Design a protein around this ligand. Structure first.
Ligand SMILES: CC(=O)n1c2c(c3ccccc31)CCCC2=O
Length: 121
């Protein structure tokens, strides 16, 4: 009965592994462009991207909460990152190139973060 206890590392360690994965998602150009900046349906003038997605999220959100240290567990990052891909597949569906761009990013995440969560999670 190997029962692991709440070990976790810290805001700095979580960054040491999560940031790198973030770079693996930002290294892409067309797939990580609108994902690094909010949409602001007001400036955009299109009330809809925020009405169907309770949490728009964006690469600038996780990276920011990480640069400061808002969460102490790694699950908060993997949960926020996937939450970002959730909105994409939740508002873009399969009828848009954004769902495609977000698709490769996700695959590149579960593949880049696999080693991290393996020793971090
Ligand atoms: C740059 C910007 O904020 N916009 C974005 C979209 C827009 C659609 C119309 C206008 C602006 C838009 C589609 C979803 C991503 C996104 O990021």
């Amino acid at each position: 009965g190997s029962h692991m206890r709440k070990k976790i590392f810290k805001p700095e360690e979580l960054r040491q592994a999560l940031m790198p994965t973030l770079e693996a998602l930002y290294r892409q150009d067309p797939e990580s462009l609108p994902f690094r900046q909010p949409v602001d349906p007001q400036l955009l003038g299109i009330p809809d991207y925020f009405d169907i997605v309770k949490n728009p999220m964006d690469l600038s959100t996780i990276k920011r909460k990480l640069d400061t240290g808002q969460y102490q567990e790694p699950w908060q990052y993997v949960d926020d990152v996937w939450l970002m891909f959730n909105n994409a597949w939740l508002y873009n569906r399969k009828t848009s190139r954004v769902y495609k761009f977000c698709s490769k990013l996700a695959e590149v995440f579960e593949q880049e973060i696999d080693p991290v969560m393996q020793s971090l999670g």
